[PDB]
């Protein structure tokens with residue numbers, strides 16, 4: 001059980017949490033870049049992990065994560081757990097099996113979460129206070145589905161996206177260090193939207209060239225063409241989705 005506490009959290013305690021998560025998720029290396037396990041050769045008993053997100057010794061939740069794609073597929077508060085509508089069928093066989101499991105009304109995608117939250121990622125603040133607020137809300141068991149979706153958007157980005165992208169983990173680090181919430185910039189959003197694109201480019205590459213060019217967006221809304229392993233933005237990839245072996 002990997003843990004992160006918001007009580008007196010620091011840039012360092014958050015970084016160590018993300019590092020521990022990255023170490024558990026890594027299935028291997030491709031072109032020196034960590035990659036998640038190949039789902040087709042992964043044993044189901046090794047597929048799902050739990051992360052504990054706590055505000056104090058008395059207030060904590062857990063999130064269940066699919067190691068094949070780093071997706072949050074479920075969360076738990078006490079004796080009750082809740083699974084995303086499109087959770088893999090096997091997720092509930094391994095996660096929170098000693099709870100009453102419930103199906104959430106929305107899919108775990110940004111598309112549906114943003115629809116249910118009535119807010120885009122760009123509009124939802126991130127940082128220690130947003131995470132603290134979300135932990136309390138899930139532990140309280142409130143049935144507001146709009147806030148459930150917003151809370152997952154926060155957790156997903158501060159946990160899963162941070163694990164995937166050094167840019168995002170560092171941005172959240174800065175937020176905790178400075179105690180200043182932030183909204184995801186166009187660079188952060190573009191990375192989230194192109195994780196599988198970048199992973200595929202790296203792994204299908206030939207002579208350091210991506211079969212297909214990936215188009216990212218930088219901080220100032222300008223397109224940045226990415227078609228090779230040497231491209232500076234490629235360094236921000238901490239964990240890749242498995243697409244194919246070389």
Ligand SMILES: NC(=O)c1cccnc1
Pocket residue numbers: 070071072073108109110156160
């Ligand atoms: N459900 C998730 O963890 C998720 C959703 C969208 C993008 N990345 C992760």
